[PDB]
Amino acid sequence: GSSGSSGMAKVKVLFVRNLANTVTEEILEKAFSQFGKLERVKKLKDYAFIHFDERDGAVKAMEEMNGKDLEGENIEIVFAKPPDQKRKERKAQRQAASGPSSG
Numbered sequence: 856g857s858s859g860s861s862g863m864a865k866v867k868v869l870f871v872r873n874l875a876n877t878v879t880e881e882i883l884e885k886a887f888s889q890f891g892k893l894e895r896v897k898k899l900k901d902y903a904f905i906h907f908d909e910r911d912g913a914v915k916a917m918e919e920m921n922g923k924d925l926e927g928e929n930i931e932i933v934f935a936k937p938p939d940q941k942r943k944e945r946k947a948q949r950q951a952a953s954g955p956s957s958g
Contacts, residue, residue, distance in 0.1 A: 867910040869917050870935035872902035875926035886925070890916035904935060
């Protein structure tokens, strides 16, 4: 059936969105703190990222706050993607066939 969705991820950072107009890093801490030791909080346009000292501390504050009425707004928490970026490239191709001529 369409029960829902389940899985397993090794992410410590929690992606919280749908923040109110009175929500700040300080509020995101104390809230996502009581659960477990926090590392840092990054606020954005409307959403923000909650950094947890441990991957566990998050899982808790995640399934605990996930969809909680924060400041009168139901915020959504989803395991954010890990910071993995790079520019890989390697090739070898060069040739020039001028081949002059006259009339």
